[PDB]
Design a protein around this ligand. Structure first.
Ligand SMILES: *[C@@H]1O[C@H](CO[C@@H]2O[C@@H](C)[C@@H](O)[C@@H](O)[C@@H]2O)[C@@H](O[C@@H]2O[C@H](CO)[C@@H](O[C@@H]3O[C@H](CO[C@H]4O[C@H](CO)[C@@H](O)[C@H](O)[C@@H]4O)[C@@H](O)[C@H](O[C@H]4O[C@H](CO)[C@@H](O)[C@H](O)[C@@H]4O)[C@@H]3O)[C@H](O)[C@H]2NC(C)=O)[C@H](O)[C@H]1NC(C)=O
Ligand SMILES: *[C@@H]1O[C@H](CO[C@@H]2O[C@@H](C)[C@@H](O)[C@@H](O)[C@@H]2O)[C@@H](O[C@@H]2O[C@H](CO)[C@@H](O[C@@H]3O[C@H](CO[C@H]4O[C@H](CO)[C@@H](O)[C@H](O)[C@@H]4O)[C@@H](O)[C@H](O[C@H]4O[C@H](CO)[C@@H](O)[C@H](O)[C@@H]4O)[C@@H]3O)[C@H](O)[C@H]2NC(C)=O)[C@H](O)[C@H]1NC(C)=O
Ligand SMILES: *[C@@H]1O[C@H](CO[C@@H]2O[C@@H](C)[C@@H](O)[C@@H](O)[C@@H]2O)[C@@H](O[C@@H]2O[C@H](CO)[C@@H](O[C@@H]3O[C@H](CO[C@H]4O[C@H](CO)[C@@H](O)[C@H](O)[C@@H]4O)[C@@H](O)[C@H](O[C@H]4O[C@H](CO)[C@@H](O)[C@H](O)[C@@H]4O)[C@@H]3O)[C@H](O)[C@H]2NC(C)=O)[C@H](O)[C@H]1NC(C)=O
Ligand SMILES: *[C@@H]1O[C@H](CO)[C@@H](O[C@@H]2O[C@H](CO)[C@@H](O)[C@H](O)[C@H]2NC(C)=O)[C@H](O)[C@H]1NC(C)=O
Ligand SMILES: *[C@@H]1O[C@H](CO)[C@@H](O[C@@H]2O[C@H](CO)[C@@H](O)[C@H](O)[C@H]2NC(C)=O)[C@H](O)[C@H]1NC(C)=O
Ligand SMILES: *[C@@H]1O[C@H](CO)[C@@H](O[C@@H]2O[C@H](CO)[C@@H](O)[C@H](O)[C@H]2NC(C)=O)[C@H](O)[C@H]1NC(C)=O
Ligand SMILES: *[C@@H]1O[C@H](CO)[C@@H](O[C@@H]2O[C@H](CO)[C@@H](O)[C@H](O)[C@H]2NC(C)=O)[C@H](O)[C@H]1NC(C)=O
Ligand SMILES: *[C@@H]1O[C@H](CO)[C@@H](O[C@@H]2O[C@H](CO)[C@@H](O)[C@H](O)[C@H]2NC(C)=O)[C@H](O)[C@H]1NC(C)=O
Ligand SMILES: *[C@@H]1O[C@H](CO)[C@@H](O[C@@H]2O[C@H](CO)[C@@H](O)[C@H](O)[C@H]2NC(C)=O)[C@H](O)[C@H]1NC(C)=O
Ligand SMILES: *[C@@H]1O[C@H](CO)[C@@H](O[C@@H]2O[C@H](CO)[C@@H](O)[C@H](O)[C@H]2NC(C)=O)[C@H](O)[C@H]1NC(C)=O
Ligand SMILES: *[C@@H]1O[C@H](CO)[C@@H](O[C@@H]2O[C@H](CO)[C@@H](O)[C@H](O)[C@H]2NC(C)=O)[C@H](O)[C@H]1NC(C)=O
Ligand SMILES: *[C@@H]1O[C@H](CO)[C@@H](O[C@@H]2O[C@H](CO)[C@@H](O)[C@H](O)[C@H]2NC(C)=O)[C@H](O)[C@H]1NC(C)=O
Ligand code: NAG
Ligand code: NAG
Ligand code: NAG
Lengths: 162, 328, 328, 162, 328, 162
């Protein structure tokens, strides 16, 4: 994808992550954990919610096609009326189809960006105290207990301590 | 051995796929369908009321009062009109309605009508309430239109210039209706109306129309070589309708006091039944109950409806690209 | 202690916000409004000239020359027409103009007119310049239309077939106007026009029209049970107009030589005044002076105008997301 | 945002930077400086100028609604004319609203990209001679005078000298 | 000295440039033009067949059978009609066709016609096949329309009410045509038709029309002060056409049995020739052979055509930004 | 550009790369090679092919303007018919022009993304075994023969071997 994270440097998703789109796995001496990151997840939810509400609002403006009857000596007017209804319907078909193809492209790329940004956010916070494995994982060069781990996840980790 | 932290994203068992500008059938974790394809195939009530179903009679047959349509003589209201194409009864006596499309429009765009008596032709100096085999009642006997009255000469060879006034003192505009009968022979003209050429005038505050008969044999239609031209007008609040004839006038008897505004639709459909249902969205292919932005039911609808698209499906990505899962 | 270089971006005190597809009220450093909401609520001059304001008279009243509209008899030009709905004077003698909408269209789409005398009825074998209480002049006396002439019989009970020719040798097409008077009684028909049934023909190179009167009592309108049908035609460059009547013709006296093309608008507005202003963009809600792509004034405009949108605001991001500032 | 720089790894803007959108702060032995980068700023100005001119050009094509009058027996034609004016106006309302929502999304992301690219451009030029602080700042591992600083800013810095 | 691996992308000698929303004339390695600007400036055959070129005669001249248009009397079919504006022959005897636009529409929308004889006027009680200097044949002698027949009185001052029937037993609907002659004098009316006022009725199962002459001098057109009003109707499968006249009727002789559906176009073009070519896309500016989505030839086309845009070029980027090459 | 690779950290293209948009140059003891990367190239071809086919499909829906004739007393209807044809043609002109300007912007950025992703893909696979030169080139810290090179290109390179 555009940002190279989803189906990219992180090769696959986690089937265990049900309550969120993006999150963390950790392993230390005290054991193992996997949980959604609620901040990055909720930011993404707000954005797609805004997009959906905008798509619904821009497609629900008042519109009506009253069918009309014409005499056998009103063939030109009958054809003109049919042209209006066909050509306006045709322009709305373009708008609806193109908007879904365009926004589906962006939505999937926006998710890819969200994953890359979360990864980059952790990489900078860890700085020289961690080795990049190149699969979305960091090997921490010091002992990092559950307190240290939560400090990385919620973004209060100060690399100068270690 | 070293302590580890990993960034990951959701994979799930969703079979949902979307199309993007650059990619077909992309699997994604969460989607929403934007096209409503479910509907109730019936003609339901709306907030404007119940549809008027015309199984037996076209609209002009009801307005002019074709004597097979007496069920529709009652004061009535509607949200829209369902006119069955198979409805056999139109104008019973052969002839055309001038500006028929505009009459059906103004009638159907109203919410209801009251039948108002404009004239009583029992007190007139003519033989009134003429009948025809062309216009049989439902009970079998020969009859005529209920809204317009066939005036012929008084029996001892008399048809003078008869005239009358009606003043619209009702709370709205009235559709009034009349006909001009054209006999096939000059013999029939004199045996019905006495005068070989007649002047029939229909006038109001704004309209000024006069009619002479055009004698000559027309092709046989429903057993008649004679022909009627049918006419209509609108008498506004406070206006006076004046009629004057010495023959050939099929004179206005009952007008239609229009009230309010319906959806102003005439649906020409055979096989979709009227339903005992209420809907926010009535399309011409049935009722829709949906918050989806689009529907593929019909481009013709009334109420608050999703936009029409001729497409089976428009699936919108909500979640992310669905990938085969890896172990954390 | 170590030497340092930092990359940064602008923050400022801008309160401007924009909407994106995914985000409401995003603060940004620089924006531009795309909708013009300022206008001058007046009807101004354009490059096509000054609007013709009709406070007293509708367009048909000016064309037919209703004798309360003598201020408009002068040769005139316009960029567009402002017709005040309250304008009381229309057709003074009761009756309808055939194809009134098409007459108002062709007249209003011209840039100017010259009144051309088609006929002088002083030399005709009739009593010309008939008057009516229905058509009072502004000075009070009973008068008639200036553009069409009420011809009645010559005093010693005479109205023969009178005919005349006019040849259009002017530099353009001419609107010519006439009427057919329909008396209420057969008595009035003979006391005005002598003949009980008349033939009035109006013919040119292309048009072939004839008219007979339709006697019968119409409802009283402005003190008249009589009625006139009003007609119009276009006499092209070099064409000959021929008129022939033995009664009931309200004959053409003055035609209108149309020149050029205006904005071809008739604005039906009460409360927006004509202004002593010049504008590149005149909307029906007032004049606009803007380079913005959109305006919310009116969908009806003339000149070079921003596109109409029913929206208060469309703010476009120029700068970047405005963030709370940090110290370098 | 999409590229993670603005309100991202660089947490806030500079109130002092008035004559440009993107620029530099430096500190060395000779003191302190903050100035807009005119090249990256002028490239961004040209792009938004092109966008605005395109938006104005695509919305200013000749358009006119002549109001029409109809008789009481021309109700169908009157309704058909009203339908044309309503439905074309409705399609233009969609175009205008959607274009502003779409281009506002892209404009803000394009600025984010411009900041990230400037940062990345400096990071590569400095190479192994500087430590990334993770806030858009680089600590240079050698003495870097005003000559050295201007050499980084205008992009003639050769890391092999140091 | 160290082993090296480098990532690179294509540069080439392409001079192709594209416009983006933010950038003009961006060089790119591969592009495609979306607007077709090539066409064959001829009117070609389509899958619906060969265009009917009318160099000499307008459509109404062919239908009514102007005697200078005898080349078109043959049964014919077309995909569309090319009517040269310079075509001199219309209605030869001065007068207008009622609903001319609707006649040209219904005729041109058919795929072909057969000329059907409705009546033989040799057996009628009138002098038939009247001629005029206004309607000269191509060979020079005075003639008349082939489709309608000028009936005058029988030589010993006789014109009774003559009537006839035609029954449409053909496989389709028939256009039938007639005229009403209006003499300039009451003298000519009696020297042609005997009766000072006539009744001419044209009736079918659905249509009921009658006509009286309107005597009076019209301006001289092609040597005639007389005038004809031209009329038309559609006789549906199985319907009976009845005509009845005692004078002034230019009676229906030949009707047109319409079959199928063409492109239903009448192209008014002078200088584009009919071509011996076949095309999938025929525009009004010539034939197009293209898979490109757009063309700038004409907004008017038939067949399967690229969409019309008034633009020289819309170049789409396929490849990437073309940069000056560097050595690997 | 948006992703900073094309006319960016890789300053120019290669005139030799004819059969592909993106590819590799290598130098080792055994000599020199330059070839297109068929996987990244073919992925890009599929995407632009899909885009082009979508653009052609969305513009080829059935459309027709039958010319009409009007009498001298049908001026209002004549003007209404002309308005329909002008205003629908005007909306299609907007759609066609805007779609080309929008998709040309995205196509060029999508190519830029494809180059950056290929570079990043190699950088991660090499990991600590290579030095980034900052021009799209990597200096490999161990001897890397043609077998080793093809292993980097086709993505089976295991950095723990060296
Ligand atoms: C309006 O109603 C008219 C009157 O209708 C009748 O009276 C009302 C009250 C009801 O009772 C209704 O049911 C009645 O029909 C109606 O006119 C009628 O139309 C019918 C159908 O066209 C006519 O029926 C035909 O009659 C002839 C003649 O019948 C006599 O002679 C024969 C031979 O000597 C005898 O066998 C009979 O017993 C009678 O003495 C028949 O020849 C004909 O039979 C043929 O056709 C029928 C099908 O229609 C076949 O089943 C047979 O096998 C034959 O092939 C019909 O029976 C009826 O004469 C006529 N009556 C009157 C008084 O005019 C009118 O049509 C209605 N108007 C409209 C527009 O519908
Ligand atoms: C066209 O103009 C017509 C003529 O107009 C007059 O002459 C011109 C030159 C001007 O001077 C103008 O100001 C004049 O009005 C016009 O016809 C006139 O219309 C008016 C209004 O309808 C008539 O006025 C009414 O007259 C009757 C009768 O008046 C006589 O008898 C009574 C009772 O014995 C006396 O009190 C009078 O002095 C007279 O001797 C009145 O009954 C009536 O009064 C009632 O109505 C008014 C309001 O209109 C109230 O103020 C009163 O309280 C009463 O309730 C009016 O005064 C006038 O008779 C009539 N004149 C003629 C010659 O026809 C015509 O209407 C104009 N046409 C159109 C279409 O407008
Ligand atoms: C329908 O056809 C009508 C008949 O046409 C003729 O017969 C057919 C079979 C062909 O042979 C055809 O070629 C013939 O023309 C047609 O009516 C004719 O119209 C023409 C043209 O308007 C008339 O020609 C003019 O005739 C007058 C009179 O000529 C006589 O007198 C003069 C003077 O004494 C002599 O010099 C002549 O020899 C004759 O004896 C001429 O004055 C006039 O000449 C002037 O105009 C011409 C140009 O037209 C100039 O070249 C000259 O210099 C002069 O300035 C014409 O020659 C012809 O008289 C007339 N014939 C009849 C029998 O009516 C009709 O117009 C056609 N209908 C339509 C609608 O087109
Ligand atoms: C029927 O005939 C009677 C008598 O002719 C009409 O009544 C007359 O109507 C006129 C005009 O309104 C009056 O002037 C007479 O005074 C009336 N005479 C009588 C004896 O009442 C009556 O109007 C006619 N009916 C119709 C419908 O025209
Ligand atoms: C249309 O669909 C709505 C939404 O599903 C239906 O409303 C629900 O009906 C059920 C059963 O009465 C209730 O338990 C829900 O609380 C209702 N939801 C809301 C938002 O009211 C509605 O019944 C359907 N309408 C028709 C006419 O069938
Ligand atoms: C609206 O969309 C639905 C879904 O595509 C259509 O229903 C399908 O129609 C096809 C073609 O006739 C059938 O073979 C399938 O069995 C239907 N599928 C489903 C899931 O229902 C429907 O016909 C479309 N059109 C209308 C007018 O409703
Ligand atoms: C008024 O009457 C006179 C006399 O009847 C008309 O003049 C005559 O007109 C005819 C036809 O144009 C000529 O043939 C006569 O020679 C004329 N006679 C005289 C004595 O001039 C005059 O045309 C009539 N006016 C109108 C308007 O019809
Ligand atoms: C419309 O707005 C323009 C632009 O603001 C006005 O033009 C300016 O007017 C002032 C005062 O005359 C001048 O100092 C500027 O030089 C003008 N600018 C330009 C570009 O000409 C203009 O006056 C306004 N028009 C009306 C009719 O009020
Ligand atoms: C055009 O847009 C302007 C700005 O939204 C409208 O002016 C506002 O209208 C509201 C609603 O009536 C008022 O309460 C505000 O006081 C106005 N605000 C401003 C800033 O002027 C205007 O009414 C819109 N419509 C038209 C036809 O001009
Ligand atoms: C020509 O005249 C003859 C004789 O008047 C017409 O033939 C008569 O037509 C009537 C009505 O159809 C019949 O009743 C007679 O029996 C017929 N008489 C004869 C002697 O045949 C004939 O119809 C007239 N032609 C036209 C066209 O009207
Ligand atoms: C329209 O263009 C097509 C495509 O170039 C032409 O079809 C080709 O014609 C040549 C010569 O006959 C053949 O060698 C190709 O095989 C054809 N291609 C296809 C796809 O059929 C076609 O001849 C042109 N049509 C006209 C009428 O000129
Ligand atoms: C369609 O597009 C082509 C290409 O722009 C037009 O052809 C050019 O027209 C210009 C302006 O008249 C000429 O000066 C050039 O010589 C033409 N260039 C080429 C490359 O042909 C063409 O006129 C456009 N319009 C139509 C109706 O075809
Ligand atoms: C989801 O799919 C996987 C792979 O086939 C399977 O192991 C798992 O049981 C599925 N989850 C369910 C049924 O909840
Ligand atoms: C901008 O806002 C800041 C924060 O409130 C304030 O300190 C500063 O004075 C403002 N700038 C002005 C008024 O120029
Ligand atoms: C492409 O352009 C370059 C630079 O001008 C030139 O050296 C080369 O010969 C060209 N390639 C050709 C002609 O194939």
């Amino acid at each position: 994808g555009l940002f190279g994270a989803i189906a990219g440097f992180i090769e696959g998703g986690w089937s265990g992550m049900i309550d969120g789109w993006y999150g963390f796995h950790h392993s230390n001496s005290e054991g193992t954990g996997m949980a959604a990151d609620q901040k990055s997840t909720q930011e993404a939810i707000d954005k797609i919610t805004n997009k959906v509400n905008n798509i619904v609002d821009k497609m629900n403006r008042e519109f009506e096609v009253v069918n009309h009857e014409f005499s056998e000596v009103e063939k030109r007017i009958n054809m003109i009326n049919d042209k209006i209804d066909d050509q306006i319907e045709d322009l709305w078909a373009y708008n609806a189809e193109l908007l879904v193809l365009l926004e589906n492209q962006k939505t999937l790329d926006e998710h890819d960006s969200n994953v890359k940004n979360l990864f980059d956010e952790v990489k900078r916070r860890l700085s020289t105290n961690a080795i990049d494995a190149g699969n979305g994982c960091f090997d921490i060069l010091h002992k990092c207990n559950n307190e240290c781990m939560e400090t990385i996840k919620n973004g209060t980790y100060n690399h100068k301590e270690y | 051995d070293p302590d580890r932290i990993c960034i990951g994203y959701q994979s799930n068992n969703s079979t949902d796929t979307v199309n993007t500008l650059i990619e077909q059938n992309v699997p994604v974790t969460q989607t929403m369908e934007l096209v409503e394809t479910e509907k109730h195939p019936a003609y339901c009530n709306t907030d404007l009321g119940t549809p008027l179903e015309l199984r037996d009679c076209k609209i002009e047959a009801v307005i002019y009062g074709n004597p097979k349509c007496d069920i529709h003589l009652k004061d009535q209201g509607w949200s829209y009109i369902v006119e069955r194409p198979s409805a056999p009864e139109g104008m019973c006596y052969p002839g055309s309605v001038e500006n028929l499309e505009e009459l059906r429009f103004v009638f159907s765009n109203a919410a209801s009508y009251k039948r108002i008596r404009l004239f009583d032709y029992s007190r007139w100096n003519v033989t009134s309430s003429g009948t025809s085999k062309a216009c049989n009642a439902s009970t079998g006997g020969q009859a005529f239109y209920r809204s317009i009255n066939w005036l012929t000469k008084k029996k001892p060879d008399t048809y003078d210039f008869n005239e009358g006034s009606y003043v619209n003192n009702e709370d709205g505009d009235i559709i009034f209706l009349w006909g001009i009968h054209h006999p096939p022979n000059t013999k029939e003209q004199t045996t019905l109306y006495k005068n070989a050429n007649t002047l029939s005038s229909v006038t109001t505050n704004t309209i000024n129309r006069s009619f002479q008969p055009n004698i000559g044999p027309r092709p046989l239609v429903r057993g008649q070589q004679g022909r009627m031209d049918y006419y209509w007008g609108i008498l506004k609040r406070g206006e006076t309708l004046k009629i004057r004839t010495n023959g050939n006038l099929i004179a206005p008897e009952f007008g239609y006091l229009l009230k309010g505004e319906s959806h102003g639709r005439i649906i020409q459909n055979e096989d979709i039944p009227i339903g005992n249902c209420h809907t926010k969205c009535q399309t011409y292919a049935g009722a829709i109950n949906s918050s989806k932005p689009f529907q593929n039911a019909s481009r013709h609808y009334m109420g608050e409806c999703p936009k029409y698209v001729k497409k089976a499906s428009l699936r919108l990505a909500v979640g992310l690209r669905n990938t085969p899962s890896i172990e954390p």
